[PDB]
Subunit: 257 residues, 6 copies
């Protein structure tokens, strides 16, 4: 089998494309910009400054998973069992995971919170090896009979850049990063799930990790803080989709409008 | 299963959160700021200059453990047994451990100094390898069946900053540190003990080990010197507790007020 | 035998030369320039800026493979058996493989888009380990009875230059490149097939990879953006051919003129 | 036990403390600054310039170990067999060991010069590996039936400053030092004996090795040259001893007054 | 034996001295300078800019090898059946090996070129590793029964200098070169054959590789361009012979005068 | 026992000192300055510029080993067995070994030149790996039952300083040197033989290798040119001898006066 070696026919590609599902962000304009919601079989980067709502979209996504109405798919190309009792893995790199906030967004979504918490796996990663190693251990979690359908890496680069300071080591960091990006892409594809990552920015404008990361994300956003609680999502890279801006808000309800 | 892999569910996170218990520091103001006292299942950092009292708080924590009335827990949540015959580990990195100082504190506190001394295991560490390894051997100490309910690391970073001078190997250092922070956090959580780390500062305001240490510690204090024997501990990082200041004294009685 | 180590005798080189075939690029001039077209047992490089058509030629190439009329060979020395069910492999470095563009190219040239997508393997590589390893796996695709006659490496250098930003680790880069470059040649030469690499450029005039690449590339082009949709391809290094330019276009038909 | 894991109870520490013995230096003023003599279970450092006595003290000690009256201890806590047939190890790093000088010192202290040579082991180390490896090999030397009670390391740092010259690989050095200081300490403790190290000085007024060494040396002197054959030794680190200066002389007899 | 260890007696040296044969370069003047021709059991180096004829000499030697007359030995030291059916190995570093030139040179030699191509193994190398390995694998070519009497390395340092650039891993390069030079000398010696190497020149008048290469090559020339097709060869380093210049030409014959 | 681990008692050192024998240099002044001749059990270094006579002494030494008038020892301490059919090893670093010069020196001293070549083993080293391996391998030659009594390293540092050129990879050079100096010191001591090394100099006035070498060689000479053929060795380091200058000549006879 060629599929076995990591190769895919032009046709395999066309086939695997049918079984993409999309997860709603609780946001009309944001959903619209993505063409329905966040895709399975892709890595999606949300980049921006502390407070731009990256961690928030992450937590919203874990609640939204526990609501089958928020998962859009072709009923013909994807079985209901594919998306059955779906679960999420949340790799927490800086301690951003808020159980309460899960509860809160759930309550407002009418989803049971207790239920979300029970279907969300949380891996507290204190350094890049742990981070990488956790992403790998997702195969084992699936193979434990856990239908992992959502993967969150929050954040993607925090550890790497706390570890590699001083340009005398970039090339290892860039190489680990590429490994990690590879794994992330691996499990989006071969377990048909959505893979979301949060990232930071810098000057004179870019998301951390240079091209290694950019080339390896399918969909890339910037998140800017608009007035008060409104936010803007700038989609600037997409496999086919056009480049657009979604405004939305983060309130006590969670993500809205 | 998933536990074996390092993953916890949201619901396990709340289930954890009921069995947390608390150790008094013998200062009312410091216990107050702490929300009752030093918490288990968290790493607690005391940063500040030589002579600011960090070693004193580590010692007092060893004395206070051997006093059932100094551990605050939920009777309906934490078995009377899980917290009985409590032992501390004191990984001593610059030779700060004074048994004479233990005596003094226990006497004054009305505790048997002898008892204290007998349930405080001291591990003298001359370098980061020894320091890091002793911490992992805590797992082994509890396998033998010792109720380790307190882990001291005094100090957290002295070895690392003596082993790494000049930007040469700085990336290894930063990861070695992250690896050490994981073990510390791992053993606070898994064994429901309190973990205290002392650290130094540098300018114009920070604790050594950068953010790699920072994100890894759940409570963080800077300890300042007041006049004479008074000191001020400044909680500036905690999950759900307000940034407050706590004044106290260091006397022949140990930590008081 | 000496038919096992890596030494091809002089005579073996001549007997080697007998079995070379050619694949039309769909331009008259470009073909002309090439001694007839893209040689098997050789590596061919298209270097130039983004949008210069490098990728297009790769695609055009995959399409053209499934059309025995576009494959010129020795009737008497290349047994017509050996060129049948010809499959292509396309190692894709930054997500350039457009399956639809394969449809397009196919139609406007009267080929089964379906046959082409069916006989094109696509290895998505997120880093240079994956890229090199995909390349080594072509031995194994063949071992499972796939008549791989076309290899595409698009890009040749995008992963390397992303991993070795910061020229402390340049030597391992260069060596890694070299090692890959061997593979590419070995498998052109031992499995009688054509290997195409695309490359990017720099300044004041050179193709990325320097000389390690240059010395291992047998045919070498610069691709310049002429007016609007026309393009020129400058052949600068070849075994025995004249140095010359070639114009053609890129349209919805594909590579033309 | 915990005892074998590297952990000592606070009671074990008190226990251990009863079995520390002392070793006279042959100078009254020096002994008194040491509060008896060179202590077992501790590392002692003499640091000063070439010619300031350091090596003389090592020699003098090798002699004095074979005068059983020069050993001070608690006959209640240390048995006569623990200090019986006492052998010294002399790790010679630059060629400082003078058998002649050993004879000489002994003839004058009424010790049999021959007995001394016969029970002083000498390891000639040309480099840091050899030096460290010999220190570790003291285990096997004892595990062979040799009551090693005195270990000389003269010099402590000469090999390292000759191997790592000007910053760059400073870290491997600083950790190799740490590993060595670990070993020296361990065998002082586990085999209840005296470890003495010689060291040089630098710019100001500090001993080579920085803090890795300082934090790991229990007692630390600077030895200055007074006039002619007189010297002064400055105690400036000790757990419970007053910092103080001892004057003494070096003569045909060895250390004296 | 001691031969097995790589040790030779002074008498073994003289005995080897006997079995040395020499290969003509078709240059009278070159030949004479060499004291007869290229020596076996030595490494001969041709250093010069591109176009100076190193490759010409290399090729010519491959042909002259195939010419019974052209190999001068001693019949009272060496048997006709050790110089019989000789073969050459030719390591190609930049793809300089032109089998057509082989043919041409050979036709003009009154020797069949086809024969030469059959008695000439060519290893195409794209980097240091492959380069080194092929030269190792020559041992094995003598094992399958091949009478390898001529080893060509063209170029000696092109790969290395394409890999190691700057001051980064210059030491890693110099040691690699050394290992390489060991191998070449070893097989020159132990399989009594002639080893030739080509090299580039740099800035201020030296062959690339420095002393590592120079100390390790018995015979060294600086080949310069004279007027037109005339070339001059400066022997500057040799065992016993004086430093001399020899003029010659490169033509349709190959090397002449 | 302790000789196994590398420990020598003080009395074993005294014993050692008795089996010490000495080899004449053929120079009166030189011999006188050495207190009789080059010593077994010691490493003697000759350092100086090219042409200073280093190699010449090496060669003289290989000759004088074959003339038993030229070996001085205690017949009571050293049985005539130990020094019978002695042999010598010459590790040759830059092709300095001259059988013809061995012959010549030997004729003039009335020794059979053939005899000297037959008991002189010659290792040609092209890099420090070989250099070091060679030296280690002398054990094996002794095991095969060759009475190795003379080890020459001509030269000590040529490889190392050729291989290293870049201040960060200097620390391995130094440790590698130290490792080898250890080997040389080992084998002088273990096999009661003389070990000679030649070294080049730098400026302002030092021999290459620094103190890593200086501390590991017992006897040390700076050899300078006089007028014409006269030469002057300056002994500047020796355990028990005064610094002194010895003048001699180098001629077709060899070393003389």
């Amino acid at each position: 089998s060629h599929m076995d070696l990591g190769f895919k026919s032009g046709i395999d590609l066309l086939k695997q494309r049918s079984t993409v599902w999309k997860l709603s962000t609780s946001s009309s304009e944001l959903d619209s910009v993505l063409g329905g919601g966040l895709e399975s079989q892709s890595v999606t980067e949300f980049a921006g400054v502390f407070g731009s709502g990256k961690t928030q979209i992450m937590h919203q996504s874990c609640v939204n998973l526990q609501n089958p109405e928020f998962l859009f798919y072709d009923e013909e190309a994807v079985s209901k069992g594919e998306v059955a009792q779906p679960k999420a893995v949340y790799i927490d790199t800086e301690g951003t995971f808020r159980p309460e906030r899960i509860m809160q967004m759930a309550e407002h979504a009418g989803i049971d919170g207790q239920t979300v918490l029970d279907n969300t796996f949380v891996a507290r990663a204190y350094n890049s090896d742990m981070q990488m190693l956790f992403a790998e251990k997702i195969e084992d979690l699936i193979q434990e009979g856990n239908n992992i359908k959502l993967v969150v890496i929050d954040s993607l680069t925090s550890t790497f850049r706390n570890e590699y300071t001083g340009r005398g080591k970039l090339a290892e960091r860039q190489q680990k990063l590429g490994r990690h990006m590879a794994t992330l892409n691996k499990l989006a594809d071969l377990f048909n799930c959505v893979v979301l990552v949060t990232n930071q920015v810098s000057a004179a404008e870019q998301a951390i990790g240079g091209h290694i990361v950019g080339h390896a994300a399918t969909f890339r956003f910037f998140v800017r803080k608009g007035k008060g609680d409104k936010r803007v999502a700038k989609l600037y890279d997409s496999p086919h989709l056009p480049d657009a801006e979604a405004i939305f808000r983060i309130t006590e309800k969670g993500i809205q409008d």
